[PDB]
C-alpha cells in the first residue's frame, strides 16, 4: 500500500507537470507564428 | 452588404484543411459555404465554410475536401448561404454525404426544397414530456436502463466492446417495423460497416428501390477530411429535424460515431489559433457538442429517437469529450472490455448504466422492483467477489453461497445472442419480449430455478429457452454416463 | 434592453462566442466589465460584455445572445454601466435568463457582480435549515447562511437533494410568517431544456414555484451566459438578504460554469494553469461562494445558504475545480455510487461528510438526538468493520444502528415532527425487536396511521402523529422535556407493542406463493413512501 501510494503521488505530479508544459508548448508556438506588421501611425509626430 | 450572393474573393493562405479567404466587399457571414471556381486542374469540386472572421474583409474557412492543388489568390464565389442539403420524402432510400449529394450512383433525386445544415435548437417552450417504455427486445437494456420513446439514447465504450454490434441489433429490432422513417449517420467510422449496413437494410426492404424505402443514409467516413466529419452529423440531423416538423412523424436517429465530431473539431482547432484545452481537446469542446445535441430532441410537432455510439479513448471514461456526453442523455449504455472477454455479450455493466424512466411513476411497479433487486445483488456479489478471492467459497456462509449463486446466474442470464451476430457466435437470436424478461428475473431472484444448472442461463432468450438447454445439457449427460458406465 | 451612451467602436474579429472591437474615430473609451450592444439589425442588438481593454485600443468581447446575427464590421455601442438584473418578489415563480430576461414555458435591479458582507457585518450561523432527509439533517446539519457542497458521481442524486431541499420548504412556509419563510433559487448551469422543463413541472407539482425561482443557461447557449448564472443567482437571492429575509441558491453545477470561464479565458488569449483552466478560477468560485452569508442581527438578519453541486470523475476528489470547490466550502455532502447502486438512497456517505459549522446548525430536539444517534452510529461502523467475514454479535449498539441505516433510507423529504419522532424511537431500543426488513413498514405505521386508535387502546390527550402542528411544540419543547416526553413514551410504547402483536406476528407466518409476494411489494411501496 505504501509503494503504491508513492507510485500514484509521483504519476499524479508528472502528469499534471506533463499536461501543463504540453499546453504552455501549444501556446508558445501559437504565439510564435504571430508577427508584427508595420505600425500605422505618426511617428514623425513625436 | 445583405444579399451576399455572387460575392468574390480571393484565397490568402492555406495551412493544411484550414484556408483564408480575403474579400474586398466584406467577408460573407459564418457559416457560409463557398465555392472555389478557379481551374486548378482539380478532381473533385472544393467548397470553404467560414468558422471565423479575422477582420472586416478576412475570414477563416474549413474546405470539406481536399486542399491539393489550391494556389494563392484562387477565385472563391460565395453561394448566398450556409450549406444546404436536401429534405423530404424523395430523400428516402439514398445515401447523401456532408454535402448533400448523392453518392449511392441511383440517379438523381427529385428535391423540392433544402434547409441548411445549421439551425437554431428548439427552445424551453418548444419540449414535449413523453414517457413511454422503448421494447428493444434485449433482455439487459430492456430490465436495467430501459429505453424511453422520444429520447435520446448513448452506447459508451471502448474500440471493439461491441458498440457497432448494438447498433445493428437495435435497427433490426426497431426499424424494421418502426411505424415513422429513420435516418443513420455514419460519422468517421469504416466505409466497409456502412457498406454492410447498406446491404443489410437492402436484404431487410428497409430500402425498397422499387418500392417505398423508409430510412436515409449520410455518411462523412474516415477517409474523408475533418471538415466534412464535422458537419455530416449536421446534414443528417438537419434531415430527420425537417421529418420531425414538416411531416410530423415520429423518426428515429442513429448516429455513429459521435465521438469524430468532437475529434474532427479538435483536429482544426489547432490551425483556427486556439490554445488546447486539458488532455488536447479545443476550448469550445462543451459548447459545440451542446449546440449540436440541444438540436437533437422531440418538441411538441414530433419525436426523435437518438440512440448514439460513444467512443472512449483507451476505455478512459473520465476522458473530457465522453465525459460531456453523459449529461446531454436519457438513457446511458456503459460497455466493459473486462465483461466482454468473460464471453457475456452484450457487454454491458450494469451497474454504470442509468436510465431516466426507472422510476415507479413511468414504468411497473414490478418492472422497477425487479431491476433494483438485481442491481443491488450484482452489488453485493461484487462486493462478496473479494471475500471470495481472499477466503474462499467454502468460507462464506450459507446466506452468501445463495447469493453468489444467484448472482452468478443472473450475470450468466443477462448474455444474450443477437440476430445480427450469428456469425461471431454461430447461433440463432433471440427476441426476449419485456414481460418476459421480468418474469424471468423475478423467478430467479426468489429461488425458482435454484436447481437449474449455471450454465443453462448462459446466452439463450427468456425462461423457456433457458429450460430447453437445460434439458439438452441433463441428456448430454446422462450419454456421457451412459458411455462411462459401460467403460 | 439596455440603454446605449455612445459607439465605442467596429467588431473586427469573431471567434465562435468571443469577440473582438477595434476604436472608433477619437479612440472612445468603454469602463473594464460592463455591458455593450451590438447593433446587428437597423432593430435588434446582441448583448456584450467587456473582458479586455488591449493597450492598442482593442476590446475583448463576450458575446451574450444573437451570436448567429453577429458579423465584423458592425457598429458597437457602450452603456457604460455593469449588468443588472430585475429583483423582487415578482420574479418568483418565473424562469429566468442570466440576463434578467423570462423565458417562456409550455421591483428593483440588482448589480450581478457585488462585495459580500464584511466581518462585522457577519453572525454565527445557529438557524438551521432543513433538507428533510434524516441523514443529512443529522450528521450532516446545514444551517441558514451556510455553504455546503454536494459532491457526488454522475447519476448519484445531486440534483434530487437540492430539489427536494428546495420542495421541504413548502409545507413550512405556508404555516409560519413569511418573515422566516425560505426563498428557493435554482440555478441551471449547461443543463438540457428538457431536464429544466422537468424540474419546474416537479416545483409546480408542490407548489414549489410560489416560493421559488429557476435561472437556466441551458446548453447551446454562449459560454458567456453559463459563466454569468451563478453570479446572478445569487444577486436575486442578496435581495432577500439585505432585507431580514433567508434565502437558498442552489448551483446545478459549478463544474459546468468552470469549463466555460476556461472556454472565455483561453478564446481570448489569457495565461492558462492547471488542466488549462486560467488563473482567476479559484477566485471566481470564492467571489461567488462567499457573498452566501448570514447577516447580524443590525442589518436585518438575512441570509443566504449556499448548495454548490459538482460532478467528480471515477470518485477522483483531486481534481482542481472539485479541490478548489472543497476548500471554499463549509464542510460537503459526499454521494457514493455504491451505496446508490446498493439501495441506500438518498447514498450519503457519512465517512466522507462533513459539517464545518456542527451542532450550531441543529434545532434543540434534533441536537439531542444526533449526539447520542453518532455515537451509535461511530460504535456500529466499527463494529461492522471487524466482522466483514465472520458472523456478527448483536449487541445493542449493533441492534440500534441497524435500524438507524434503514431509516436513512426515503424518497422523498420528511416533515420535521415524523423524522425526529421516528429517530426518537430508534434510539430508545423501541424497534429492537423489530426485524430490519419491517422497519419502513413500521415507520409508515407509525407516521400515517395509529394503531392505539384503531384497537381503541390510545390514552394520550394530546399527543398523537396525526397532530401535525405538534411539530412546533417539538421544536420549542425538546422530547426530552416533562411536557412531552411522558406521553411520547406511552405512544411509542404502545404503538411497538400492538405492531409486534398484530402486524410482524402475521408477517413471520407467510407461507404461500403470492402472499410472500404481496409483502415483499408491500415493503418496497413503504420503503419509498417514508
Ligand atoms: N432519494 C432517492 N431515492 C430514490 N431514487 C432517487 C433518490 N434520489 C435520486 N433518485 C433517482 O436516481 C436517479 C438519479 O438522480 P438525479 O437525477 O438526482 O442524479 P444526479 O446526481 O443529478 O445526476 P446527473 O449527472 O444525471 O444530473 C433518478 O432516477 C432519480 O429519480
Ligand atoms: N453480440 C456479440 N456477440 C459476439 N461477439 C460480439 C458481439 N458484439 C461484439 N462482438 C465482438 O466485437 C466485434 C465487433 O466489434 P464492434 O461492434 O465493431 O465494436 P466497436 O464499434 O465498439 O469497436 C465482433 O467481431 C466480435 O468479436
Ligand atoms: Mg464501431
Ligand atoms: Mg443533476
Redesign the interface.
Known sequence: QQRTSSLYNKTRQFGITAALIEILSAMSSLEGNAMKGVRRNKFWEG | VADHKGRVGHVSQVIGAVVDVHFAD??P???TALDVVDKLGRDEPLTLEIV?????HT?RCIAMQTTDLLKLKAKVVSTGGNISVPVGRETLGRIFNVLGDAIDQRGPVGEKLRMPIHA????????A?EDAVLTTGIKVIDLILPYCKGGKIGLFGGAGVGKTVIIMELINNVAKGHGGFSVFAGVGERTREGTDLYLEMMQSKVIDLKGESKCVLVYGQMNEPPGARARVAQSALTMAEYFRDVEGQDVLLFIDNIFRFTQANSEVS?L?????????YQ??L??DL??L???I?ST?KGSITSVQAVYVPADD??DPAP?TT???LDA?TVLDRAVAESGIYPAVNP?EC?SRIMD?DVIS?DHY?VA?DV??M???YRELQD?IA??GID?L?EEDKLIVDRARKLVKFLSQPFQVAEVFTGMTGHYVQLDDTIDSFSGLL?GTYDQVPEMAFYMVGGINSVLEKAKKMAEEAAELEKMRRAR | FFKTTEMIGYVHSIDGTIATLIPAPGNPGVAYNTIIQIQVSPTTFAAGLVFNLEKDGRIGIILMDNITEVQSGQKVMATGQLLHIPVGAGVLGKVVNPLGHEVPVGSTLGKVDTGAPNIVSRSPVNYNLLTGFKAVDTMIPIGRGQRELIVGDRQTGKTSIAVSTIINQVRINQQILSKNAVISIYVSIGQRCSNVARIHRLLQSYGALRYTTVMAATAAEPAGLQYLAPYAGVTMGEYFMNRGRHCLCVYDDLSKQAVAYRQISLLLRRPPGREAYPGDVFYLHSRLLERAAMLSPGKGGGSVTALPIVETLSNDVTAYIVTNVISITDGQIYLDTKLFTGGQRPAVNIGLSVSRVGSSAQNAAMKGVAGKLKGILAEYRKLAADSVGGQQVQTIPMIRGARFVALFNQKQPSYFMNAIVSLYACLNGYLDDVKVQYVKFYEYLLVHRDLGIMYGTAKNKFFYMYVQELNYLIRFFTLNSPILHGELEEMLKQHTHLFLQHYQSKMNAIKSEKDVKALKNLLYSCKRAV
Open positions: 466584406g467577408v457571414p459564418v457559416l471565423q472572421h479575422l477582420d472586416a475570414g437554431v435548437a428548439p427552445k424551453l417552450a418548444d419540449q414530456a489547432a483556427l489559433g486556439r490554445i488546447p484545452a486539458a488532455v488536447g476550448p469550445t462543451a459548447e451542446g449546440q445535441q440541444e438540436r430532441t411538441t471514461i473520465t465525459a453523459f449529461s446531454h446511458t451497474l442509468a415507479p411497479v422492483n433494483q442491481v443491488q450484482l452489488t453485493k471475500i481472499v477466503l468460507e456462509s426468489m
